Amino acid sequence: SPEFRSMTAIEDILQITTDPSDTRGYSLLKSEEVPQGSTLGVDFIDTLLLYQLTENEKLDKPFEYLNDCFRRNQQQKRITKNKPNAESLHSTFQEIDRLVIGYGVVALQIENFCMNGAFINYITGIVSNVNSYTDFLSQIIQRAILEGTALDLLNAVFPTLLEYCNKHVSHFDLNESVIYNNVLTIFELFVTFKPIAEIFTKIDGFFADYSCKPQDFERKTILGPILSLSPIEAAVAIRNYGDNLLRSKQQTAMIHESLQAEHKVVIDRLFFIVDKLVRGSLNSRTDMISYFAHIANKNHLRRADHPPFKELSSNGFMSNITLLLVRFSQPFLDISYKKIDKIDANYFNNPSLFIDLSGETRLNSDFKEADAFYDKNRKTADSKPNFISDCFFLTLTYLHYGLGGTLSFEEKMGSEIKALKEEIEKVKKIAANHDVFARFITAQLSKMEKALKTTESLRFALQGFFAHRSLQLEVFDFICGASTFLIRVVDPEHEFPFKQIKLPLIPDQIVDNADFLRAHAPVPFKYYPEFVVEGPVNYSLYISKYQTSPIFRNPRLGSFVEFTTMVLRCPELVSNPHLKGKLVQLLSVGAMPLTDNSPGFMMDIFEHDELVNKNLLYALLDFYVIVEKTGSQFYDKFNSRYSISIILEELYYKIPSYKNQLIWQSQNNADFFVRFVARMLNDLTFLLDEGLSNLAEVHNIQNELDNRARGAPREEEDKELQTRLASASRQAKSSCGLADKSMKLFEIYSKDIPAAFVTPEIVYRLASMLNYNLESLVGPKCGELKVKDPQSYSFNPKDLLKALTTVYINLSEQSEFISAVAKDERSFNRNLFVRAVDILGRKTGLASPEFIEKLLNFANKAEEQRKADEEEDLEYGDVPDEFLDPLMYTIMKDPVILPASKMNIDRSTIKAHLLSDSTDPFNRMPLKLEDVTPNEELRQKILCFKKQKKEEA
């Protein structure tokens, strides 16, 4: 028959018979009388299924049965298409299709339908073999959309997928390759349906509860587990690296590459998923902002010195979100900057709607002011977001707290590893004779060994991640874009990068101007959070240690150098000197010559970017001085000066226009130039002492460590010494290093502008500073120093001497200089130069014979000036100096003390001076004749002296 042909097709497709007892594994219908009719056909199909699913049996995997029912149906359509009479069975396939799909929706909407299994089991079956449920599921989704019940379906699947991820796999992470892929395939299947994408964020548990702890964001929140897929997850790092931590570079490289390849795919898939949500509707998109903003708000401790890691989101989770946000920000920050004005510069002109700014330090402002600025401004309630602007500032938020917390975690690991190896070494020495104690000690070793394997494994994985150029590139390009944007916010015109910005914003100020600077700081920039600057710079400093750094040769690098230079040029912009310290450190990294002696990677920008080449030099010379005003702390005024000096030196060697602006400044803006030099000079009076002293402190500390028989002469804590020992090593390197750079700078400048160095405010201080340094270098202060590997501590007494003596040569034709050096009793001795010559000839090629003769020639002129002076005093110096008027050169009659300069001067001289010029004549301070003070004591000495002379000759 053909009624027959239908009937049996049902048997095969549903695997069920009625009367029926033999042949294939099908289940006998029990025991319904109405469906004990030995016909069959299209309208018994509801009943067969209804029995199949609710009167049950050992039908233990009902959703799988549905899915195989569907696949059996699709296959029987194909077999049929090409056979004698396809058409007559069409009604039958139609009906199985109708109902297998309908009950698939039902099975995934209400829990108790079948009495075998529940949601968890069904979706477990789905996860295991996702490709086999894809066509079916797709049809189920569509049917739910058509019936107005998509949400109910979503509330069945996605909360269930949550539990599946936390509770039915030991660890949902990158190790579980089949499972995390299949989970992604599920999100992609659902969220590719537009009506699903538009309501996804309404799923139960999409947001975190009020009580949800930060570490559980990635566990208790619908998107959490997939967002946490990453190679920088401990269990992933351990599996891939902790496996064999002694692999060669080549062997580690292969692992980095697999995990980088796999992480790229994860980020692509996560982005695709989240972009769907963003594109769904304003609600979904607003809820994403809201979702990411909550995670960020509750993870600020990720940037504390000692983060509570177990109470915070994980690095993989926070980094992956940072990258997705970078990816949504890309389009409005492409290099044409044609959409740069989509980002609202006044984002913070009002109380913030998503990002919690309480406790956030601002660039040049405090709380009182920022809250007051709100008053004046706000923006009427309802007048809010701009998804773009939300996304840009959230990206900056996560760059700092997300990746920023991830990089500082990796950075500290080299020390954690070394300390942990030392404890293990020491616990391994214990001889534990007692069985309980031996078990305790082995438990202690074993726990430390495990912590060590975790750390060493994670360090590899984090390195794999940060060395991933393709991903890090996006972070940096975001940063470059963010820099251009920030230049625009600063621009009074708000026209940049379409019109150059004019610097400086306010005229250059010629003692406690922080208030002044804050007051003329530009608005709204001064209210932006510090994190918008600290995130980029922390990232850039850190990322610089990677050979594959995204910064190296990146054509957008210039935008960031531009922003940095503007920041260093205009002190009103960023008040925080540690931050500026980091920035100049960054420029110094780009200034360092390469290992092959090519220019540093930023040299090109320094030369050809109009904005940089117009401002950098001045910015550096200014900042060198300003860091003095309280700038212990470890982006030190001395570290900053060391950084500046590197840039100054390289600019001068390799870029003629910078040599010229340096010479220009000294010829045409002398007061500014001299202020920098006086500072360089003054630090050079003590830096070598400071370095030698820390080196001696290093030895005192190390000899106490050696004692063994022990004083203790006080040993305090053995770890307080090890701390103090490192601390003295740092200070030694920083002091010696800066002294090197400073002397080198005196050398190359004095070569070209000797005259700048011989004006009265510099020349005597300089002579005295050179001679004092010369004393250390050729005497026991440097002679008795012996540390092992003094290069570790930038200690090259030989180069420092070579540079010091080149400065003498470079000024040897300035007579004020020859004279100042001849008249400094405190250090000048011709023999210092003789010893200098002796010491330099000890490193062969250090000084040319020509050099040595110029040095001796210098020493002779000076020694000769000294003799002339001494002969002149002996033969014509008949009145003691303190008795002579400083201006008239004659015996004073009535000495008076000037109150500002403290100089002694004859009453009549000051009176002749104040008749025409109401100032102290030595320092230009205001002065009225009345304020002058009688030097009765000195007056006596003169009279007494005069009495002696009158009475004989």
């Binding site: 509801d46 609710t54 929706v105 909407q109 108790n112």
Partner: protein, 72 residues
Amino acid sequence: LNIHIKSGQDKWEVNVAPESTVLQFKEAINKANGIPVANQRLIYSGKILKDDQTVESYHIQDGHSVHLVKSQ
């Protein structure tokens, strides 16, 4: 109509006017079987029912089986 409210073990026959909604069809059972207002879930011919739609809007027959589910 003449409709049988299966489960796998149970039945509570009902009479209801076709043009009447399913919200009446819930409360035609609530006080005739033992189960509360919102603890009802009705499944027929592949769809889940809705309070607002009529029993005839689903085209349910005389001598026909509608299934029910206890709703925690």
